[PDB]
Amino acid sequence: MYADLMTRTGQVTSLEKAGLNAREPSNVLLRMALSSPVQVLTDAAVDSAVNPIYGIAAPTLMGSVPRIGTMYSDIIMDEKYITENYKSVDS
């Protein structure tokens, strides 16, 4: 995992602010969490960066919950099975 992340872009990248900025540049919120919030925010604003919400840090900073683990998949009610096996409350 360590090596694959550090060699993802075809060049050895660090596990530091410089390395993160090269692997996930658009992820303004994640880079803000790491360090230097004000500089990252200023560069994002002037750049007009669009930050997709993924990972752990960005949803957490946006007040949401990361879409991982139990939240990776989606649960949708089975209308057909419910329709055929259940009765409406207003009976």
Partner 1 sequence: ALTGQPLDGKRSHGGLRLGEMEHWVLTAQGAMQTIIEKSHDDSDGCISYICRNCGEPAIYNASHPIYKCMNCDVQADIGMVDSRRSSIVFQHEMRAANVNITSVLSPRVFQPA
Partner 2 sequence: MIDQKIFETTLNIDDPTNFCTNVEAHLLKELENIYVGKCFKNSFILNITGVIQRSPCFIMRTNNSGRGYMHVRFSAVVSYLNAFDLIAAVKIIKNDSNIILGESLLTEPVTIVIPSSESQNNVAEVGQIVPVQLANSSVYYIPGRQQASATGSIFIPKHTFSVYHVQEELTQEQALNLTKLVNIIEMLLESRSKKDFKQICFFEKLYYTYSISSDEILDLKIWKGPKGKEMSRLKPCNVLSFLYDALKNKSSSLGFWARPPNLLKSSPLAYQQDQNSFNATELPIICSAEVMFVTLLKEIINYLQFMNDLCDTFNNEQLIKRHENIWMLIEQRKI
Partner 3 sequence: EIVESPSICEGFVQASSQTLVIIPDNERITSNVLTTFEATRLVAVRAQQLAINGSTMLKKKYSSPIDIAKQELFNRKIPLLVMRCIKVTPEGQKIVEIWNPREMGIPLLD
Question: Under the criterion CB under 8 A, does residue 68 sit at the interface with partner 2?
Answer: no
Question: In b/e form, how buried is each residue of 13-31, taking b as 16+ CB within 10 angstroms?
Answer: beeeeeebbeebeebbbbb
Give the residue, chosen from 10, 46, 63, 74, that forms a contact with partner 3 under the rule CB under 8 A: 74
How far apart are the C-alpha atoms of 41 and 47, rounded to whole Å? 10
**What are the distances in angstroms from CA 29 to CA 2, 34, 66, 67?**
22, 9, 13, 16
How far apart are the C-alpha atoms of 34 and 76, rounded to whole Å? 36
Q: Which is nearer to partner 2, 48 or 88 (CB)?
A: 88
**Which residues between 17 and 76 bind partner 1 (CB under 8 A)?**
41, 44-45, 56, 60-66, 68-71
Q: State the nearest-atom distance from the C-beta of 24 to partner 1, in Å.
A: 17
Residues that bind partner 1 (CB under 8 A): 41, 44-45, 56, 60-66, 68-71
Residues that bind partner 2 (CB under 8 A): 64-65, 67, 71, 74-79, 82-83, 86-89
